[PDB]
Amino acid sequence: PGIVELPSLEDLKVQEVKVSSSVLKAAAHHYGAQCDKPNKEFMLCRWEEKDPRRCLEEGKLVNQCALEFFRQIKRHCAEPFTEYWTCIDYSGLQLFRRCRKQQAQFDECVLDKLGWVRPDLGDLSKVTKVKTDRPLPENPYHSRARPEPNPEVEGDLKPARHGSRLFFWTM
Amino acid sequence: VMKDVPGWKVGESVFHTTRWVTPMMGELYGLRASEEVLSATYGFIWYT
Amino acid sequence: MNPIIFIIILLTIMLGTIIVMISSHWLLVWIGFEMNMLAIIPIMMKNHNPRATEASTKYFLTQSTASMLLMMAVIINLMFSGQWTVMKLFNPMASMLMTMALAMKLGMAPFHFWVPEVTQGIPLSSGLILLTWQKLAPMSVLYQIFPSINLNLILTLSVLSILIGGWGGLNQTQLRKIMAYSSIAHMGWMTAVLPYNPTMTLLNLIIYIIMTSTMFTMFMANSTTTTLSLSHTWNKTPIMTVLILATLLSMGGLPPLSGFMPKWMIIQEMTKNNSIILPTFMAITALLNLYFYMRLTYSTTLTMFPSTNNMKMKWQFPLMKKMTFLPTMVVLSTMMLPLTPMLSVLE
Amino acid sequence: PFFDVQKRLGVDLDRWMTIQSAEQPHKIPSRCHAFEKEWIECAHGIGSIRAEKECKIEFEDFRECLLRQKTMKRLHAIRRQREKLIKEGKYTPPP
Amino acid sequence: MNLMLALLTNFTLATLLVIIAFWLPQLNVYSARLPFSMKFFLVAITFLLFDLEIALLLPLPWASQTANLNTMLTMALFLIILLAVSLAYEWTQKGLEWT
Amino acid sequence: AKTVLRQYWDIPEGTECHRKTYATTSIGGAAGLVVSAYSVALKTPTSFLEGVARTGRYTFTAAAIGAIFGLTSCISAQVREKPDDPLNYLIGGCAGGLILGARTRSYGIGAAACAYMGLTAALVKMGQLEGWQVFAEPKV
Amino acid sequence: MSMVYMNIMMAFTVSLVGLLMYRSHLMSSLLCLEGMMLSLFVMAALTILNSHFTLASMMPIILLVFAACEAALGLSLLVMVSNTYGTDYVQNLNLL
Amino acid sequence: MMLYIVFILSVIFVMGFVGFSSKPSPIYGGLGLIVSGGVGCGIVLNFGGSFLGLMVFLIYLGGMMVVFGYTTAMATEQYPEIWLSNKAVLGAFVTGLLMEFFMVYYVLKDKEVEVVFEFNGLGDWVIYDTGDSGFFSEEAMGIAALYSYGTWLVIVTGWSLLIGVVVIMEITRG
Amino acid sequence: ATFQFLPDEARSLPPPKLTDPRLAFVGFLGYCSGLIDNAIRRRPVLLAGLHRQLLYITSFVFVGYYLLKRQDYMYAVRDHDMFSYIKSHPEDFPEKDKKTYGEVFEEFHPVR
Amino acid sequence: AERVAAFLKNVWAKEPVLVASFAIAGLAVILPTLSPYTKYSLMINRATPYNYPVPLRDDGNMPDVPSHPQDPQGPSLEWLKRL
């Protein structure tokens, strides 16, 4: 067996999205609409390549889009967004249904100042299609050549030559 | 640690295939403090 | 027992066996054995007496133990191959455990002790199921796992069953114990050829079942469970003595009778594989069976034992037992040798 | 199966649970899915006599994923060397 | 962790109360068959068999999330109906009488 | 068994008599222990010591039979200068048969054992020379 | 193999040895039989859970259901034996 | 150390088996199987098998073993023998514990052992899965599938349980 | 095929003749079963229930005929398999060079 | 019918618990096939997204697959929101 090739620690550095899950939860619906393209490109790479080392550049673009997404909230909608995810953060299950009044304020804000429309029920679970210039991998499983099948037996079935040929039998 | 062990190859796979293999718990945390290993292994199961 | 319940229980005995034979999953095989054992215990107990309870308990303990060993082998197989497909096993300890588990179910020596005990303690009709139908499911599993069975274990089990079955029958006056030991020896022939040609395992099994069903059916028609009771047959139904004579000569492997066929064909397959000593030893040991089969023919058909006066009362009444399929079975038990090439249908 | 009623009738009585690369609820994969799939595809249709020889690479990898005996050995080995140097004082763990 | 502590505390407290309940000052200076019916064995065995099938019904709340509702509903009712047949058999064979 | 049996056959005939006698005595003693185990398990001894006595009787008898066979057969090959000769095992097989007659205090068992053990031992030597298979591997 | 399999396998062997080495009570042997099922249940569950073979998650439940049903039958034979002799001692079961 | 919970539980599992397998009074034999059942559930729970662990408590302990003890009181023993009074029970019990202690001592010492077969001693946590972030219990999904994928399992299982009622009623009627 | 008594390819083979000596022997076995049926139940062996004797012969022949078809089919398949393997593996079945007896040396063993 | 009505009245008088059990069990078997809402049960269960919806590699021949989650193509849950 060979050597497992690993990227260097310097290849793995990227600005991190260091916000808590209640913050991601609060912005998730608008994040799904805004950052769909780099997100869906990266997920296509992962299910096609089946190898984390082969999708690191797409992974960094995922972070870069999320950081620009959250900077846009910070520039125009910081106060309505903080009121909303704090409301989410209070719940032990982080429930949307307990925060509709604060969600509406955060939603009226991004729609007005950023043009963001919250995707409708069922939208973010759609299967989509992405145009990637990354070539389709040929042998993602790294399969060896398969063993050759046994020769196919063919022809016309004829009666057994002189029958069963069991000891003395003539049939 | 294995610089002087004779015949050792660093980072050698145990699999014939060169396909990426998901590492198990020991591979990731095999050299780390027991506390992080407790959390990684039994934290979810032991969380109320 | 209500006749409808008896029918449903019998169909459950058959269903569990059929589940074993059609299953591709080890779990369903194990379920089939579990279903089958549950439904057979009540037909062992149906006469409700201490001897039937003892037989049922001994049978339950043996079969339950073998079911646990079988499931242990299956789980070991899962650990080392990650799959449940019924086929060759992927671990030698799994293969040994399953082989011993299946040997116990069949009652092969040295796991044989329960077969004479249990058969004696249950009615003839229940003994007919135990020594015929109950062989199908374990044999059908051996038919599929044989490539991974250890040759020395299987041949050692086969050789012991032929020896124990032969010697065990010499000392018997009870017909059920004679059948039990006769069964143990025949299983040894069946498994001895299995590593070489499973088709000859199936041929031996089918013919053994036919001959075994014939004997049990004839014992039932007269209510004979002992040699001496059977020796009164000449003075009631003379035809039955002739039929019992022919079937006994056939179960002894005498040409030109049907029971010669499985031993003839097994000897051939073994020799084709350069196995001379083993088939020779098996054939000679099988002469032990012929001795105590012949002894029954002497006391039943070829001589006339003393009778009793009350026997005259029996002359006035006909046989009312069903003796279902007996005329067909006895003809197949004795006259099939000219059709030996028909074995290819088992291929 | 002894009698292959299932294939004759086109009914799936128990094939669905036989292997771990078969269809699972919500497409949940088994840990060794890729390894089982590789071995099965290699050995398909050629017979177990050929398979035990010609698909031996795929099967050893599958057994390594199933039980992790080489991996546990390699880790257990690196750990001894570590404890030796720590005790002998020629190694110091990073922070 | 929290569950193991809660369990330890419950039975530790029960142990302490019991042993204390047994030790206090006082101030004192000076293998057969029970004659018990076969009927009670059958109640226990009947409970066991019914309990085993309730084990098979317990997953039903999860099974109703399936897209294969035709099959799920049929199998769920099949099981409960067979459970009812078992009771009807006990009942009509006088397995539930105490006289 | 494989380990001990392979040791016996590895040693050439008529050389290292003591090494041959250890292999047969070990093989014989193991057989006697096997018989004792089943005898004690199936026919229960009256007392613990009686069980120990029975194991010693069977285990010593089997070892003695194996010891004399290995000694007798290997000396004969050495004395006669006939290594690959079945007759050496015929002599060894009969000597072992006589000891059984002695241990069981019977002349009939000794006469029968001589004939039955002698032929069996001689056939084992022909099988070794001729390559006869007892448990033959499936070939066809 | 992992540590656990040693002890679970050891537990199964202990109960099997207990099963094969009867004392007097038939109930004690029935307990060894159910001990074997328990160790089979644990070993099956561990193998199935650790490999994340999802559909087999049901297998151990099936095993428990059938083994319990087998245990109910074994108990029924025990009481029928005890009704005949007044004890469940296996040395009474020697008529055959 | 808590990282060895499964190993420690498996040791208690085995010692409980040496307990009931040495065959004290079936009253105490039943207790040892009950403790093993609880410990056996503990092992399963630490592999993510919450449902399967609880079924051991519900069906094995709460169902089957309750009936075992019930039958023991009726037809086996009402008065238990003093524990380990018999020499065979004491010898086997001590013999079994002695093997378990030696098995444990060497595994802990060397972090491996060869008891007939080779076993590792790093710790059971090493082989655990590292990735997990589905919103469901996989075990529960697999068990729920008994009603969608397992039609055939349900039919044979349900039939067998009905036959169990029929069979046991025949058996005990006398 | 799979779990099929007489697959479709078997229809390429000639059927057994209804005058097949093996089928005649099967019918005789069916006749013998009819006589044994009369004997065990103590009926007149030759005359009793000719309707029942007829169904014995018919059932044996009907089942025997189909068993003989599968028998002959299974030997045809064996031969088809054998010859295909020999054609696929000509290196294992060389056409050996055959000497005449004038060329081959055989030792003489006098019988005196 | 008249004979059946008399039989039902007799068991209503004598075994009202059993009559209720059989009526309820009959409705459990029968009403799912007659109910207009039973079809939404499958649709709702189908619509619940338990795992990630892996995207497709756009090849230029997929006019029915959306490029964005807020595009009009693809399945809609409008029936569910109204329902």
Ligand SMILES: CCCCCCCCCCCCCCCCCC(=O)OC[C@H](COP(=O)(O)OCCN)OC(=O)CCCCCCCCCCCCCCCCC
């Ligand atoms: C064809 C290829 C296959 C070839 C293999 C050979 C097959 C032969 C076996 C066929 C299957 C068994 C059927 C045998 C038929 C027996 C017929 C018979 O013996 O006669 C019956 C006779 C009836 O007696 P009863 O009831 O009293 O009525 C008459 C009034 N006395 O009964 C009696 O009277 C009883 C008289 C006492 C018994 C005398 C014993 C000697 C007779 C032995 C003949 C049977 C030989 C069978 C052994 C196999 C032969 C090779």
Ligand SMILES: CCCCCCCCCCCCO[C@@H]1O[C@H](CO)[C@@H](O[C@H]2O[C@H](CO)[C@@H](O)[C@H](O)[C@H]2O)[C@H](O)[C@H]1O
């Ligand atoms: C009667 C009591 C029954 C108690 C049963 C208890 C269950 C015991 C299960 C043990 C399973 C271990 O099974 C055993 O494991 C080792 C681990 O590699 C396997 O492997 C071993 O042999 C093979 C040989 O090719 C190689 O992998 C290697 O030489 C060696 O490691 C064995 O082939 C297998 O037989």
Ligand SMILES: CCCCCCCCCCCCO[C@@H]1O[C@H](CO)[C@@H](O[C@H]2O[C@H](CO)[C@@H](O)[C@H](O)[C@H]2O)[C@H](O)[C@H]1O
């Ligand atoms: C004791 C009496 C015995 C009577 C036996 C009666 C017949 C039993 C047949 C049960 C199996 C029926 O047939 C089988 O079942 C279910 C539907 O029901 C189907 O299986 C269904 O569930 C899962 C869900 O994905 C998948 O296996 C499959 O995709 C789906 O179609 C199988 O594709 C079908 O082949």
Ligand SMILES: CCCCCCCCCCCCO[C@@H]1O[C@H](CO)[C@@H](O[C@H]2O[C@H](CO)[C@@H](O)[C@H](O)[C@H]2O)[C@H](O)[C@H]1O
């Ligand atoms: C001892 C044997 C006992 C057997 C008991 C069997 C009882 C079975 C009763 C209910 C079986 C059918 O139950 C129900 O029937 C209706 C028929 O409209 C089906 O139909 C419903 O769901 C389907 C899904 O394909 C929709 O497309 C359809 O529009 C809707 O009406 C349900 O999918 C099915 O769940």
Ligand SMILES: N=C(N)NC(=N)NCCc1ccc(I)c(Cl)c1
């Ligand atoms: N000889 C084995 N051990 N097995 C086996 N039956 N191999 C197949 C050889 C064979 C023999 C007869 C026929 I008819 C057919 Cl079709 C094929």
